[PDB]
């Protein structure tokens, strides 16, 4: 109403100043449901919104799509209702062998992998992370006692062939991504997802403050396959984690 | 159960060979309902699918979302299923002062401005739109007496600022239009044997009626089975 | 005396506006030869031209020369003198193991391996190829009943390393074309020419209509080698080809 | 005698697993001098290295020279060494209006418009650095009740090019600084399993006290062993 | 019958291991009209070749057509045919002041505005003379009293467009002249372990007799025998 | 003083118009030594300066630093001191098997692997050698009887990963430079170093005249490693062509 896609008015925000973004308009009730005096408050393609309360004070769960161009939408239009602290909450696969399913991934920084980036900032500018934002999911999770770790997390425009995937309808990928996995493991590359370059460039380069966590369903460098409530569970836990850091960043 | 994020198998395509791939799920459905014998499949994320038949042959209708990354998704995963042509419709803007509300486009090939193209193909590549699908949408947009234009269209990951929106070297270049998701769709195509067409009705020109692309691209479908 | 260096004034021309562009002079005769009154307008460096009628309007048949920046200067001029429909008559290798010596491909964009093209849109612009230009040489080779390959063509600034060429002197290619061939191959590109990426870029950029067709008279990619009067008669073809084409389009 | 510019052993580290990297031998001597024990070991061009101890735990300090190049062949040779935390403490100029001169910036993550973080990563990696580090030098600041700025700094190879000396599109993007070493520093460490910090003190603003950043960088580097 | 497009075989040149590179065939001909027993081999598209003798050695003339693309396969073709030494005579325009028409221009390297060049070799990599060539042109240009100048050529796709035909940055940073050709062949040779070297004469400049060029390049190539 | 790094005044230099530049303040002295009345003028960083005379005329000599960064600030504040002609003195290991210990290398123009050089011309801009520096080297060299190369030089921001070493503390190098070595080995490349492409291209692009000779003192593609002696003897015959060089450019 006041945007152009979310079909949002300003004081449907209750001057929040604070929101929790997830991809999934499943996953936006049940972190909402965390917090006190959950209300729907629009549903419109994949941007579903509700608004809730944390220590008196009004807080918007809204999801952001897949990939970039969804999530910019997202993201544009909600810091013109007012928003100024992202809390990114996924879901991921790992891509370092000693990293577990159940432990938490929280991003200090994206490989620029993507594409609406660009339209923000040159490539030479850094996807980086809020100090603020990164040190409230970290206490969050040790608080929680998840076993944590932080560093980079590659960001592509792509499921497939930007992670490297062979199992698909055509078997190859294109010579800029073949052999990339690799590279990225030995450079300490955590996981991959699609959203995070975008989010983190257009807040660090517009004085807006935004972090991420993850809880890690599965990993593809590991022979064991995930439990069906272990990633359940993880999901829990991840969601947990976001809550307690927008506490301490209100 | 077959695919990561569609929540589609195999044998819910029934044979189908053709998809037609749209933004939104509120255009599949009036897709799908200009066919016979339609049914909703699934519903996960941005990727709404339906099933029809045209000519006794089934097709699918699934929804894309916004921009390259999630189109490629939804073309990668029905292409595990066992489709081979790709049909997009869409809505757009004209940047051409001879192109008018009402009118119909036509792609032969997108300027890329997206990032997805390039997880398929380096830039130098075309994206460029398959001649059977690109004559078939020519063909059923005259068999209903549209006024068509058929040429480029730009293609961004932005909505906003990759539109002008408060450099006009697109125009001065014969560029009919803009939108989001064409680029990463011919060029991951075109790259990868699959054939794929893209239309669009013109619904705003700076410079001066949508369900008739909408029976457009279910004729042309027609002509392509 | 009207351009700077084709020799030619407007007049010259009688008002044609459609040209056919074969790249070597000593076939600029023979394809004007297929049309009524052919006759030798001038000659200069390796632009050859001779004016024809079809159906009663004037054509222009005139040579491009090698490479990118030849072709730019032909073009150009030509455009200057009128001329607004391009129709390329190659012949050429293919690089697909299933295209047969005889058959025809009509190319409906290229790949930009070139430098000239640059000069007229950037990189992000496709060297696409006009529609009903297209659509006629399509036709054209259908009614003469040849077995034809519509898609993309690779355009080189070179014979040798662009192509992936390893017998030559030194027997080495660059990084950038090292297994390029291989990637092409498994892209759907059906043949490797010096040309196209100028003309289609500067055409669609400009205005102007073009489109290009070529005899496969050679596979690197097969082991029987090609017949001497075959490759002649692939020849003729693609002549007869792009005058049947021409005539569509006036 | 076991690398190849610093004429340092292993031997000669006596166990330290953390360096402290300014660009200037006479800002060593001043850092090694608030330790405990400080010893000069070396001193081979540009590469100035003292050995001292905090907490009873070896620590060397190590000037880097001028830019990206010479700071690459410092910490890569005493990574050989042993060496796998290392921060560098610099002053510079601030270009926000509301940093003022003795402020003190902690580097979260740096632009990358050298040359030589591109032989370590490609320009889309991250300049980033460490969370312990970083927070141990934001604890450190605080500890001495220094008003601190933590965020982005751009680092490139001029010095006078480089910051408009006779583009404001830096400032515009928060930008907090400029200086030339950090986008390698960072880069070679969080592409390469080496953990890195950053910080500095305010010795001018074009809009609008360094022995401070001295003392926080030593005090970081106690909370890192 | 050796090579694809010159229609040469080895024996053809009688143990040449030079070649005089200039664009056009009215010019070969002159040129081999400067030397003793001037023979005509062939002529293919773009590509008319002379043989003639040097001090009783062999020498080759051979035009190269218009652009990088047609100059690389007349270079390629040649050294497979055992070429080892190749050198260009040229006529253009300056862009510098001081550089009179009647003026020789020696190029040192070119400024590699090309496509072809890059099927070569990176861009970071020169585009570079044969120190030999070079002073050999430049010997070869006091010779007849020529005034000579040495230095950076600006080597493009275009000749209009890319030469200011309705930026003057090339001029500030000291470029002499604008041409065609001189990047690839400069580029290709020297990356490709063959000498080359580039001569040409001016015949006009914005800022205000071609027998003589043609001279020193045979002149030239005596010296390199 | 009348600079911002160097600290020396206009009068310093007496008028001198030429300077020589090692990398190492420890060779200022030794060079300087070889010419008449050696005077030491300042030393600030890696900026040690030392001033002489050279049949009759003024001469500096002055420490470059390492890298780009450190040469460019060199280079610009001696050039505001009225130096115009500069000759790079150094020692080198070679990237070819026939080039030996003792031989000497004269650079034509280098390959520009580093950041520095961008700051004073785009890429496509050759980092080319004066031609009269080039050859008063190669005469020099000559003259004294040494076994003389003259090509192109790699010039690297990094001595690890940009000269594709690999014993290293993490054994890597970024796709970039893998396989690099063997690239520029067939291009015929020499040698490998720091400094040329910021030197080469600042006085190429600025009006002024550079040069640059090494000796060989070690070669990374030979079994047989270097003498003690050798090594220093190469030095001092290096030092001897670069003074005898600039004794022709006064």
Redesign the interface.
């Not at 799509?65 to 969804?70: E, K, T």
């Not at 490539?123 to 980086?128: D, G, I």
């Not at 294109?174 to 991504?177: L, P």
């Not at 660090?204 to 004085?207: E, F, I, L, W």
């Given at each position: 109403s006041d945007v152009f896609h979310l079909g949002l008015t300003k004081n449907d925000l209750q001057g929040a100043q604070l929101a929790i973004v997830p991809?999934?308009?499943e996953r936006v009730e049940k972190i909402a449901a965390l917090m006190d005096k959950p209300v729907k408050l629009a549903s419109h393609?994949?941007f579903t919104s509700w608004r809730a309360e944390l220590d008196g004070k009004a807080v918007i769960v809204c999801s952001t799509?897949?990939?970039?161009?969804?999530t910019?939408?997202a993201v544009?239009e909600l810091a013109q209702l007012g928003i100024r602290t992202f809390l990114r909450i996924g879901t991921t696969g790992a891509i370092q062998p000693h990293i577990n399913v159940g432990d938490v991934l929280?991003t200090?920084?994206?490989?620029?992998?993507?594409?609406?980036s660009?339209?923000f900032?040159p490539?030479?500018?850094?996807?980086?992370?809020d100090?603020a934002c990164?040190?409230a999911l970290?206490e969050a999770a040790k608080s929680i006692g998840a076993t944590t770790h932080?560093?980079?997390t590659a960001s592509?425009?792509?499921?497939?062939?930007?992670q490297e995937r062979y199992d698909?309808?055509?078997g190859?990928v294109?010579?800029?991504?073949k052999?990339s996995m690799e590279?990225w493991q030995?450079?300490?590359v955590m996981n991959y997802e699609?959203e995070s370059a975008t989010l983190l460039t257009m807040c660090?380069?517009?004085?807006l403050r935004a972090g991420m966590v993850a809880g890690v369903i599965v990993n593809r460098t590991q022979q064991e396959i995930p439990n069906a409530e272990t990633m359940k569970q993880t999901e829990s836990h991840a969601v947990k984690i976001v809550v307690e850091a927008a506490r301490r960043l209100l």
């Open positions: 991809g999934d308009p393609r994949e799509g897949i990939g970039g161009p969804s910019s939408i544009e929280v200090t920084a994206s490989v620029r992998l993507d594409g609406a660009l339209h900032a490539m030479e500018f850094p996807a980086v992370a100090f990164t040190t970290v932080v560093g980079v592509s425009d792509t499921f497939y062939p930007g698909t309808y055509s190859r294109v010579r800029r991504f052999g590279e030995a450079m300490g699609m660090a380069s517009q004085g």
